[PDB]
PDB file of C-alpha atoms and ligand atoms in Angstrom:
ATOM      1  CA  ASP A   7     -23.778  29.856  16.284  1.00 23.99           C
ATOM      2  CA  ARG A   8     -24.854  26.059  16.465  1.00 21.71           C
ATOM      3  CA  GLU A   9     -22.409  26.058  13.447  1.00 25.36           C
ATOM      4  CA  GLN A  10     -19.636  27.546  14.847  1.00 26.68           C
ATOM      5  CA  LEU A  11     -19.913  25.195  17.438  1.00 27.80           C
ATOM      6  CA  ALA A  12     -20.580  22.176  14.733  1.00 25.29           C
ATOM      7  CA  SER A  13     -17.189  23.095  12.941  1.00 25.96           C
ATOM      8  CA  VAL A  14     -15.503  22.416  16.625  1.00 27.93           C
ATOM      9  CA  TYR A  15     -17.368  19.102  17.006  1.00 33.17           C
ATOM     10  CA  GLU A  16     -16.571  18.110  13.717  1.00 32.92           C
ATOM     11  CA  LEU A  17     -12.438  18.506  14.176  1.00 35.43           C
ATOM     12  CA  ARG A  18     -12.950  16.960  17.210  1.00 32.46           C
ATOM     13  CA  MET A  19     -14.675  13.971  15.877  1.00 28.53           C
ATOM     14  CA  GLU A  20     -11.821  13.434  12.974  1.00 28.53           C
ATOM     15  CA  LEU A  21      -9.139  13.902  15.608  1.00 28.76           C
ATOM     16  CA  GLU A  22     -10.864  11.406  18.803  1.00 26.72           C
ATOM     17  CA  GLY A  23     -11.006   8.929  16.070  1.00 28.16           C
ATOM     18  CA  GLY A  24      -7.432   9.065  15.551  1.00 33.24           C
ATOM     19  CA  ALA A  25      -6.519   9.230  19.187  1.00 35.97           C
ATOM     20  CA  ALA A  26      -8.518   5.730  19.746  1.00 36.96           C
ATOM     21  CA  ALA A  27      -6.531   4.464  16.818  1.00 35.70           C
ATOM     22  CA  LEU A  28      -3.221   5.173  18.245  1.00 35.51           C
ATOM     23  CA  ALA A  29      -4.154   4.002  21.776  1.00 35.86           C
ATOM     24  CA  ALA A  30      -5.447   0.713  20.374  1.00 33.01           C
ATOM     25  CA  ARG A  31      -1.356   0.526  19.409  1.00 28.90           C
ATOM     26  CA  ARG A  32       0.565   1.969  21.640  1.00 30.09           C
ATOM     27  CA  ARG A  33      -1.592   1.440  25.490  1.00 31.58           C
ATOM     28  CA  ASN A  34       0.463   0.781  28.287  1.00 29.48           C
ATOM     29  CA  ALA A  35      -0.955  -1.407  31.202  1.00 29.74           C
ATOM     30  CA  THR A  36      -0.755   2.007  32.816  1.00 31.78           C
ATOM     31  CA  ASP A  37      -3.304   3.526  30.350  1.00 30.78           C
ATOM     32  CA  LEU A  38      -5.223   0.541  30.447  1.00 31.54           C
ATOM     33  CA  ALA A  39      -5.869   1.097  34.125  1.00 33.06           C
ATOM     34  CA  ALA A  40      -6.842   4.476  34.088  1.00 32.21           C
ATOM     35  CA  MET A  41      -9.290   3.740  31.375  1.00 32.86           C
ATOM     36  CA  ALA A  42     -10.754   0.833  33.935  1.00 32.62           C
ATOM     37  CA  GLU A  43     -10.884   2.945  36.840  1.00 35.10           C
ATOM     38  CA  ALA A  44     -12.840   5.829  34.729  1.00 34.11           C
ATOM     39  CA  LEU A  45     -15.050   2.849  33.329  1.00 35.18           C
ATOM     40  CA  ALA A  46     -16.062   1.602  36.634  1.00 35.56           C
ATOM     41  CA  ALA A  47     -16.746   4.904  38.270  1.00 39.45           C
ATOM     42  CA  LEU A  48     -18.799   5.534  35.065  1.00 35.57           C
ATOM     43  CA  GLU A  49     -20.692   2.218  35.646  1.00 34.99           C
ATOM     44  CA  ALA A  50     -20.951   2.876  39.476  1.00 39.38           C
ATOM     45  CA  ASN A  51     -22.803   6.354  38.861  1.00 38.00           C
ATOM     46  CA  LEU A  52     -24.992   5.591  36.261  1.00 37.28           C
ATOM     47  CA  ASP A  53     -27.904   6.879  38.439  1.00 37.60           C
ATOM     48  CA  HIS A  54     -25.815   9.984  39.279  1.00 35.46           C
ATOM     49  CA  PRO A  55     -25.309  12.286  35.833  1.00 32.07           C
ATOM     50  CA  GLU A  56     -23.692  15.151  37.634  1.00 29.65           C
ATOM     51  CA  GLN A  57     -21.125  13.108  39.342  1.00 29.64           C
ATOM     52  CA  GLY A  58     -20.575  11.006  35.979  1.00 32.04           C
ATOM     53  CA  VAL A  59     -19.529  13.804  33.881  1.00 33.91           C
ATOM     54  CA  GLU A  60     -15.999  14.041  35.841  1.00 38.14           C
ATOM     55  CA  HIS A  61     -15.350  10.202  34.779  1.00 39.19           C
ATOM     56  CA  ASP A  62     -16.242  10.825  31.066  1.00 37.82           C
ATOM     57  CA  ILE A  63     -13.805  13.454  31.299  1.00 36.64           C
ATOM     58  CA  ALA A  64     -11.350  11.285  32.917  1.00 38.00           C
ATOM     59  CA  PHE A  65     -12.295   8.070  30.397  1.00 35.39           C
ATOM     60  CA  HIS A  66     -11.815  10.144  26.839  1.00 32.77           C
ATOM     61  CA  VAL A  67      -8.783  11.968  28.708  1.00 32.13           C
ATOM     62  CA  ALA A  68      -6.966   8.512  29.274  1.00 35.00           C
ATOM     63  CA  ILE A  69      -7.620   7.688  25.898  1.00 35.94           C
ATOM     64  CA  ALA A  70      -5.587  11.234  24.717  1.00 34.04           C
ATOM     65  CA  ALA A  71      -2.790  10.380  27.201  1.00 34.50           C
ATOM     66  CA  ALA A  72      -2.947   6.674  25.203  1.00 34.39           C
ATOM     67  CA  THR A  73      -1.473   8.373  22.492  1.00 34.10           C
ATOM     68  CA  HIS A  74       2.047   9.159  23.886  1.00 34.58           C
ATOM     69  CA  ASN A  75       1.972  12.467  21.576  1.00 32.07           C
ATOM     70  CA  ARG A  76       2.059  15.357  23.399  1.00 31.39           C
ATOM     71  CA  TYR A  77       1.016  17.792  20.347  1.00 30.02           C
ATOM     72  CA  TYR A  78      -2.243  15.566  19.635  1.00 29.55           C
ATOM     73  CA  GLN A  79      -3.176  15.308  23.575  1.00 27.59           C
ATOM     74  CA  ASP A  80      -2.408  19.401  23.727  1.00 29.13           C
ATOM     75  CA  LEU A  81      -4.794  19.825  20.757  1.00 29.26           C
ATOM     76  CA  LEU A  82      -7.500  17.100  21.945  1.00 27.07           C
ATOM     77  CA  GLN A  83      -7.604  18.805  25.267  1.00 28.02           C
ATOM     78  CA  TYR A  84      -8.029  22.490  24.029  1.00 31.57           C
ATOM     79  CA  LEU A  85     -10.920  21.457  21.752  1.00 32.66           C
ATOM     80  CA  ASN A  86     -12.551  19.850  24.334  1.00 29.47           C
ATOM     81  CA  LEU A  87     -12.337  22.695  26.835  1.00 32.17           C
ATOM     82  CA  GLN A  88     -13.855  24.587  24.244  1.00 30.62           C
ATOM     83  CA  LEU A  89     -16.568  22.684  24.175  1.00 32.01           C
ATOM     84  CA  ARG A  90     -17.427  22.562  27.468  1.00 32.66           C
ATOM     85  CA  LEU A  91     -17.393  26.257  27.533  1.00 31.22           C
ATOM     86  CA  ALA A  92     -19.740  26.499  24.480  1.00 30.72           C
ATOM     87  CA  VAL A  93     -22.365  23.824  26.013  1.00 28.37           C
ATOM     88  CA  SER A  94     -22.893  24.998  29.485  1.00 28.07           C
ATOM     89  CA  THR A  95     -26.669  23.427  30.179  1.00 22.28           C
ATOM     90  CA  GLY A  96     -31.478   5.605  27.762  1.00 20.33           C
ATOM     91  CA  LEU A  97     -28.994   8.482  28.660  1.00 21.34           C
ATOM     92  CA  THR A  98     -26.736   6.718  31.357  1.00 20.11           C
ATOM     93  CA  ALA A  99     -27.092   3.262  29.799  1.00 18.96           C
ATOM     94  CA  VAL A 100     -26.661   3.686  26.399  1.00 20.42           C
ATOM     95  CA  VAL A 101     -23.684   6.224  26.561  1.00 19.77           C
ATOM     96  CA  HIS A 102     -22.097   3.312  28.641  1.00 18.71           C
ATOM     97  CA  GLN A 103     -22.379   1.293  25.954  1.00 18.22           C
ATOM     98  CA  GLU A 104     -20.603   3.347  23.368  1.00 20.27           C
ATOM     99  CA  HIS A 105     -18.269   4.100  25.970  1.00 20.63           C
ATOM    100  CA  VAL A 106     -17.579   0.192  26.341  1.00 19.18           C
ATOM    101  CA  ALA A 107     -16.923  -0.295  22.707  1.00 19.50           C
ATOM    102  CA  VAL A 108     -14.373   1.796  22.454  1.00 21.16           C
ATOM    103  CA  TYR A 109     -12.886   0.417  25.423  1.00 22.58           C
ATOM    104  CA  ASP A 110     -12.942  -3.161  24.176  1.00 21.08           C
ATOM    105  CA  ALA A 111     -11.202  -2.253  20.453  1.00 17.50           C
ATOM    106  CA  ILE A 112      -8.760  -0.293  22.327  1.00 15.49           C
ATOM    107  CA  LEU A 113      -8.346  -3.566  24.973  1.00 15.52           C
ATOM    108  CA  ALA A 114      -8.111  -5.669  21.750  1.00 16.11           C
ATOM    109  CA  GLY A 115      -4.976  -3.647  19.499  1.00 14.87           C
ATOM    110  CA  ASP A 116      -7.398  -3.241  16.985  1.00 12.46           C
ATOM    111  CA  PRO A 117      -7.046   0.240  15.437  1.00  6.94           C
ATOM    112  CA  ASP A 118      -9.678  -0.188  12.872  1.00  9.98           C
ATOM    113  CA  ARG A 119     -12.485  -0.977  15.483  1.00 11.59           C
ATOM    114  CA  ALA A 120     -11.532   1.656  17.770  1.00 13.41           C
ATOM    115  CA  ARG A 121     -11.782   4.380  15.483  1.00 13.23           C
ATOM    116  CA  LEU A 122     -14.895   3.339  14.183  1.00 13.22           C
ATOM    117  CA  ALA A 123     -16.110   2.701  18.032  1.00 10.59           C
ATOM    118  CA  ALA A 124     -14.893   6.178  19.053  1.00  8.01           C
ATOM    119  CA  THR A 125     -16.573   7.608  15.698  1.00 11.78           C
ATOM    120  CA  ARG A 126     -19.697   6.149  16.474  1.00 11.13           C
ATOM    121  CA  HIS A 127     -19.752   7.411  19.899  1.00 12.42           C
ATOM    122  CA  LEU A 128     -19.220  11.382  18.926  1.00 10.46           C
ATOM    123  CA  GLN A 129     -21.912  10.731  16.042  1.00  6.72           C
ATOM    124  CA  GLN A 130     -24.809   9.305  18.327  1.00  6.28           C
ATOM    125  CA  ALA A 131     -23.624  12.194  20.856  1.00  4.90           C
ATOM    126  CA  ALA A 132     -23.840  14.771  18.312  1.00  4.17           C
ATOM    127  CA  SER A 133     -27.215  13.834  17.455  1.00  2.00           C
ATOM    128  CA  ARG A 134     -28.877  13.561  20.886  1.00  2.49           C
ATOM    129  CA  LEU A 135     -27.095  17.327  21.170  1.00  2.00           C
ATOM    130  CA  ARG A 136     -29.009  18.655  18.119  1.00  2.00           C
ATOM    131  CA  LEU A 137     -32.435  17.299  18.954  1.00  2.00           C
ATOM    132  CA  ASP A 138     -31.939  18.410  22.825  1.00  2.00           C
ATOM    133  CA  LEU A 139     -31.421  22.161  21.445  1.00  2.25           C
ATOM    134  CA  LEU A 140     -34.571  21.991  19.500  1.00  2.00           C
ATOM    135  CA  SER A 141     -36.914  21.075  22.086  1.00  2.88           C
TER     136      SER A 141
ATOM    137  CA  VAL B   4      23.460  13.303  12.228  1.00  3.28           C
ATOM    138  CA  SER B   5      21.297  16.661  11.102  1.00  3.51           C
ATOM    139  CA  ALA B   6      18.971  16.080  14.166  1.00  3.95           C
ATOM    140  CA  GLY B   7      19.516  13.864  17.266  1.00  4.38           C
ATOM    141  CA  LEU B   8      16.780  10.929  18.355  1.00  5.13           C
ATOM    142  CA  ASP B   9      14.692  13.471  20.704  1.00  5.52           C
ATOM    143  CA  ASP B  10      14.286  15.870  17.338  1.00  5.95           C
ATOM    144  CA  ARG B  11      13.681  13.090  15.393  1.00  6.21           C
ATOM    145  CA  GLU B  12      10.483  11.597  17.709  1.00  7.29           C
ATOM    146  CA  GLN B  13       9.186  15.340  18.221  1.00  7.94           C
ATOM    147  CA  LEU B  14       9.047  15.945  14.649  1.00  7.80           C
ATOM    148  CA  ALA B  15       7.691  12.456  14.080  1.00  9.76           C
ATOM    149  CA  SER B  16       4.690  13.143  16.760  1.00  8.75           C
ATOM    150  CA  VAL B  17       3.987  16.234  14.528  1.00 12.16           C
ATOM    151  CA  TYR B  18       3.742  14.735  11.462  1.00 11.67           C
ATOM    152  CA  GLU B  19       1.530  11.839  13.271  1.00 11.45           C
ATOM    153  CA  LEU B  20      -0.592  14.713  14.054  1.00 13.98           C
ATOM    154  CA  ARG B  21      -0.838  16.401  10.678  1.00 14.02           C
ATOM    155  CA  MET B  22      -1.478  13.113   9.103  1.00 15.63           C
ATOM    156  CA  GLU B  23      -4.692  12.571  11.247  1.00 13.14           C
ATOM    157  CA  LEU B  24      -5.663  16.360  10.338  1.00 13.96           C
ATOM    158  CA  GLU B  25      -4.664  15.808   6.584  1.00 14.55           C
ATOM    159  CA  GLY B  26      -7.061  12.714   5.945  1.00 18.74           C
ATOM    160  CA  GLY B  27      -9.891  14.566   8.179  1.00 18.12           C
ATOM    161  CA  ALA B  28      -9.684  17.550   5.437  1.00 17.37           C
ATOM    162  CA  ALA B  29      -9.300  15.113   2.434  1.00 15.65           C
ATOM    163  CA  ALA B  30     -12.592  13.551   3.410  1.00 17.58           C
ATOM    164  CA  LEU B  31     -14.323  16.692   4.057  1.00 13.62           C
ATOM    165  CA  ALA B  32     -13.091  18.053   0.847  1.00 18.68           C
ATOM    166  CA  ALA B  33     -14.091  15.370  -1.216  1.00 16.09           C
ATOM    167  CA  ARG B  34     -17.832  15.793  -0.453  1.00 16.94           C
ATOM    168  CA  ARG B  35     -17.848  19.253   0.014  1.00 15.88           C
ATOM    169  CA  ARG B  36     -15.822  20.868  -2.810  1.00 15.26           C
ATOM    170  CA  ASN B  37     -17.442  23.019  -5.108  1.00 13.06           C
ATOM    171  CA  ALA B  38     -16.141  24.736  -8.400  1.00 11.06           C
ATOM    172  CA  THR B  39     -14.166  27.701  -7.036  1.00  8.95           C
ATOM    173  CA  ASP B  40     -12.112  24.846  -4.450  1.00  9.68           C
ATOM    174  CA  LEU B  41     -11.441  22.433  -8.031  1.00  7.49           C
ATOM    175  CA  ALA B  42      -9.827  25.840  -9.505  1.00 10.05           C
ATOM    176  CA  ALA B  43      -7.515  26.275  -6.519  1.00 10.99           C
ATOM    177  CA  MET B  44      -6.442  22.971  -5.917  1.00 13.39           C
ATOM    178  CA  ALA B  45      -5.849  22.513 -10.075  1.00 12.62           C
ATOM    179  CA  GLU B  46      -4.064  25.604 -10.403  1.00 15.58           C
ATOM    180  CA  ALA B  47      -1.617  24.532  -7.338  1.00 16.22           C
ATOM    181  CA  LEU B  48      -1.164  21.299  -8.794  1.00 16.68           C
ATOM    182  CA  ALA B  49      -0.487  22.696 -12.316  1.00 11.96           C
ATOM    183  CA  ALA B  50       2.546  24.957 -10.679  1.00 10.62           C
ATOM    184  CA  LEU B  51       3.932  22.050  -8.813  1.00 10.23           C
ATOM    185  CA  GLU B  52       3.820  20.249 -11.989  1.00 10.36           C
ATOM    186  CA  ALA B  53       5.633  22.677 -13.919  1.00 10.74           C
ATOM    187  CA  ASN B  54       8.150  22.959 -10.988  1.00 13.70           C
ATOM    188  CA  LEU B  55       9.579  19.357 -11.188  1.00  9.04           C
ATOM    189  CA  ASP B  56      13.265  20.565 -11.534  1.00  7.26           C
ATOM    190  CA  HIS B  57      13.039  23.968  -9.325  1.00  7.66           C
ATOM    191  CA  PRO B  58      12.313  22.226  -5.642  1.00  5.19           C
ATOM    192  CA  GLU B  59      13.098  25.919  -4.227  1.00  3.22           C
ATOM    193  CA  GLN B  60      10.031  27.349  -6.232  1.00  2.00           C
ATOM    194  CA  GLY B  61       7.734  23.827  -5.282  1.00  2.00           C
ATOM    195  CA  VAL B  62       7.520  25.066  -1.873  1.00  2.00           C
ATOM    196  CA  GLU B  63       4.996  27.794  -2.289  1.00  2.86           C
ATOM    197  CA  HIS B  64       2.986  25.769  -4.452  1.00  2.00           C
ATOM    198  CA  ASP B  65       2.635  22.787  -2.168  1.00  2.00           C
ATOM    199  CA  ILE B  66       1.599  25.166   0.778  1.00  2.00           C
ATOM    200  CA  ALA B  67      -1.099  26.354  -2.060  1.00  2.86           C
ATOM    201  CA  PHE B  68      -2.242  22.910  -3.072  1.00  2.00           C
ATOM    202  CA  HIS B  69      -2.591  21.718   0.919  1.00  3.08           C
ATOM    203  CA  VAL B  70      -4.566  25.285   1.861  1.00  5.99           C
ATOM    204  CA  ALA B  71      -6.891  24.957  -0.982  1.00  8.56           C
ATOM    205  CA  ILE B  72      -7.748  21.490   0.458  1.00  7.57           C
ATOM    206  CA  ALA B  73      -8.511  22.967   3.895  1.00  8.69           C
ATOM    207  CA  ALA B  74     -10.856  25.565   2.113  1.00  9.27           C
ATOM    208  CA  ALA B  75     -12.730  22.910   0.535  1.00 10.07           C
ATOM    209  CA  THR B  76     -13.633  21.466   3.869  1.00  8.15           C
ATOM    210  CA  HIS B  77     -15.658  24.636   4.181  1.00  6.31           C
ATOM    211  CA  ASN B  78     -14.822  24.612   8.291  1.00  7.21           C
ATOM    212  CA  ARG B  79     -13.831  27.871   9.133  1.00  5.76           C
ATOM    213  CA  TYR B  80     -11.801  26.222  12.174  1.00 10.26           C
ATOM    214  CA  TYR B  81     -10.218  23.154  10.445  1.00 10.71           C
ATOM    215  CA  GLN B  82      -8.993  25.580   7.395  1.00 11.28           C
ATOM    216  CA  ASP B  83      -7.569  28.046  10.041  1.00  7.71           C
ATOM    217  CA  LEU B  84      -5.635  25.319  12.232  1.00  6.82           C
ATOM    218  CA  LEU B  85      -4.554  24.209   8.827  1.00  5.98           C
ATOM    219  CA  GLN B  86      -3.069  27.376   7.603  1.00  3.71           C
ATOM    220  CA  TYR B  87      -1.134  27.868  10.493  1.00  4.20           C
ATOM    221  CA  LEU B  88       0.431  24.171  10.236  1.00  4.74           C
ATOM    222  CA  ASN B  89       1.362  24.305   6.615  1.00  3.57           C
ATOM    223  CA  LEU B  90       3.535  27.699   7.246  1.00  6.90           C
ATOM    224  CA  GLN B  91       5.686  25.156   9.172  1.00  7.73           C
ATOM    225  CA  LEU B  92       9.495  25.118   8.373  1.00  7.34           C
ATOM    226  CA  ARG B  93      11.082  22.518   6.220  1.00  6.17           C
ATOM    227  CA  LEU B  94      14.757  20.948   6.338  1.00  6.12           C
ATOM    228  CA  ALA B  95      17.414  23.106   5.608  1.00  6.76           C
ATOM    229  CA  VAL B  96      18.829  22.989   1.711  1.00  3.48           C
ATOM    230  CA  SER B  97      22.328  21.428   1.176  1.00  2.00           C
ATOM    231  CA  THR B  98      24.193  21.013  -1.870  1.00  2.00           C
ATOM    232  CA  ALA B  99      24.894  17.019  -0.838  1.00  2.00           C
ATOM    233  CA  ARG B 100      21.011  16.610  -0.311  1.00  2.00           C
ATOM    234  CA  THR B 101      19.753  18.678  -3.398  1.00  2.00           C
ATOM    235  CA  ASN B 102      22.151  16.750  -5.591  1.00  2.00           C
ATOM    236  CA  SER B 103      20.807  13.297  -3.950  1.00  2.00           C
ATOM    237  CA  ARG B 104      17.281  14.374  -4.386  1.00  2.00           C
ATOM    238  CA  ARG B 105      17.557  15.369  -8.243  1.00  2.00           C
ATOM    239  CA  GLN B 106      18.982  11.646  -8.649  1.00  2.00           C
ATOM    240  CA  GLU B 107      16.167  10.354  -6.506  1.00  2.00           C
ATOM    241  CA  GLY B 108      13.773  11.781  -8.578  1.00  2.00           C
ATOM    242  CA  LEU B 109      12.018  13.053  -5.286  1.00  2.00           C
ATOM    243  CA  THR B 110       9.683  15.558  -6.814  1.00  2.00           C
ATOM    244  CA  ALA B 111       8.428  12.754  -9.209  1.00  2.00           C
ATOM    245  CA  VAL B 112       7.375  10.511  -6.283  1.00  2.00           C
ATOM    246  CA  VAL B 113       5.821  13.415  -4.376  1.00  2.00           C
ATOM    247  CA  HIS B 114       3.956  14.912  -7.292  1.00  2.00           C
ATOM    248  CA  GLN B 115       2.311  11.604  -7.745  1.00  2.00           C
ATOM    249  CA  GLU B 116       1.282  11.315  -3.978  1.00  2.00           C
ATOM    250  CA  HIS B 117      -0.075  15.224  -4.294  1.00  2.00           C
ATOM    251  CA  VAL B 118      -2.080  13.695  -7.535  1.00  2.00           C
ATOM    252  CA  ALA B 119      -3.457  11.158  -6.036  1.00  2.00           C
ATOM    253  CA  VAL B 120      -5.342  13.090  -3.384  1.00  2.00           C
ATOM    254  CA  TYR B 121      -6.656  15.590  -6.128  1.00  2.00           C
ATOM    255  CA  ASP B 122      -7.635  12.441  -8.225  1.00  2.00           C
ATOM    256  CA  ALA B 123      -9.686  11.279  -5.205  1.00  2.00           C
ATOM    257  CA  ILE B 124     -11.188  14.679  -4.054  1.00  2.00           C
ATOM    258  CA  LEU B 125     -12.293  15.406  -7.777  1.00  2.00           C
ATOM    259  CA  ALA B 126     -13.954  12.184  -7.669  1.00  2.00           C
ATOM    260  CA  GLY B 127     -15.883  13.081  -4.565  1.00  2.00           C
ATOM    261  CA  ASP B 128     -14.536   9.779  -2.978  1.00  2.00           C
ATOM    262  CA  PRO B 129     -14.006  10.381   0.814  1.00  2.00           C
ATOM    263  CA  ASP B 130     -12.275   7.277   1.908  1.00  2.00           C
ATOM    264  CA  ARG B 131      -9.794   7.293  -1.255  1.00  2.00           C
ATOM    265  CA  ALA B 132      -9.318  10.918  -0.423  1.00  2.00           C
ATOM    266  CA  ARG B 133      -7.923  10.277   3.261  1.00  2.00           C
ATOM    267  CA  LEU B 134      -6.430   7.165   2.206  1.00  2.00           C
ATOM    268  CA  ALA B 135      -4.372   9.453  -0.389  1.00  2.00           C
ATOM    269  CA  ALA B 136      -3.827  12.230   2.275  1.00  2.00           C
ATOM    270  CA  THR B 137      -2.834   9.988   5.229  1.00  2.00           C
ATOM    271  CA  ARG B 138      -0.086   8.121   2.822  1.00  2.00           C
ATOM    272  CA  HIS B 139       0.989  11.705   1.657  1.00  2.00           C
ATOM    273  CA  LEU B 140       2.107  12.392   5.401  1.00  2.00           C
ATOM    274  CA  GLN B 141       2.977   9.022   6.072  1.00  2.00           C
ATOM    275  CA  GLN B 142       5.883   8.885   3.515  1.00  2.00           C
ATOM    276  CA  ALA B 143       6.737  12.584   3.949  1.00  2.00           C
ATOM    277  CA  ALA B 144       7.767  11.992   7.851  1.00  2.00           C
ATOM    278  CA  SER B 145       9.596   8.396   6.624  1.00  2.00           C
ATOM    279  CA  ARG B 146      11.736  10.409   4.211  1.00  2.00           C
ATOM    280  CA  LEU B 147      12.052  13.183   6.694  1.00  2.00           C
ATOM    281  CA  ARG B 148      13.571  10.806   9.444  1.00  2.00           C
ATOM    282  CA  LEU B 149      15.823   9.129   6.794  1.00  2.00           C
ATOM    283  CA  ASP B 150      17.375  12.827   6.243  1.00  2.00           C
ATOM    284  CA  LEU B 151      17.812  13.347   9.664  1.00  2.00           C
ATOM    285  CA  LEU B 152      19.593  10.133  10.195  1.00  2.00           C
ATOM    286  CA  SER B 153      22.169  10.414   7.247  1.00  2.00           C
ATOM    287  CA  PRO B 154      24.094  14.001   7.412  1.00  2.00           C
TER     288      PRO B 154
HETATM  289 ZN1   ZN C 213     -17.875  10.199  26.035  1.00  2.00          ZN
HETATM  290 ZN1   ZN C 214       2.523  17.953   0.076  1.00  2.00          ZN
END
């Protein structure tokens, strides 16, 4: 059950790393606005965790839309939808640091740094979930 | 052309997603492969090796090799998505294409790519396995584009 969930989390981690790499090379000015407006809303709502969830979804969705691959986006959306349904319940600040490193790498046009920023965000998040469920 | 630009763009997108999934599967397989996984990859590879002059018989073996790697991830979700994606239909057989591919020696080039993934997975080396699996998918998409532009 935690390992049925963990199996989806592993697959999402691989795909999200790839999405950031494609987004690093194919991002539009339109793609940059959606990631930036989601990031600014995420920065505004640091003291309201419940409002921030919509923005984190919007930020990852903007990276997925920046791939310009419909098949890739549909699979990422389906895995993301499955994970939200399965896990129904400095956190504001450390997650913003991880969220910002992906955005800078994508802004730079650097695919390798983007993949590692996106991968590190998923790994640190996974470590936070494992430990929360134990206590 | 056998396929027009929008069919070529959709196909390249499908290979692009397949490329990323194969790279993740090779890395997972490199770390977690057990004695039963090594036997299944070796057996499919031996069969592909034995059928270099018969491209027709090869398809079944190619699916078995990619499927054994997906099993070696030991992630049921990844394995099942890959089993489904590797049943994908391939480009139609043509007398002209079959004659040019033999002169090509396409099967030997492809065997070296299938072989580079097995060697990396056998060596318990994840970055090497991911690099070989991604290269296999990139070359296949590139070969497929040239075939769609040439009939
Ligand atoms: Zn996030
Ligand atoms: Zn193959």
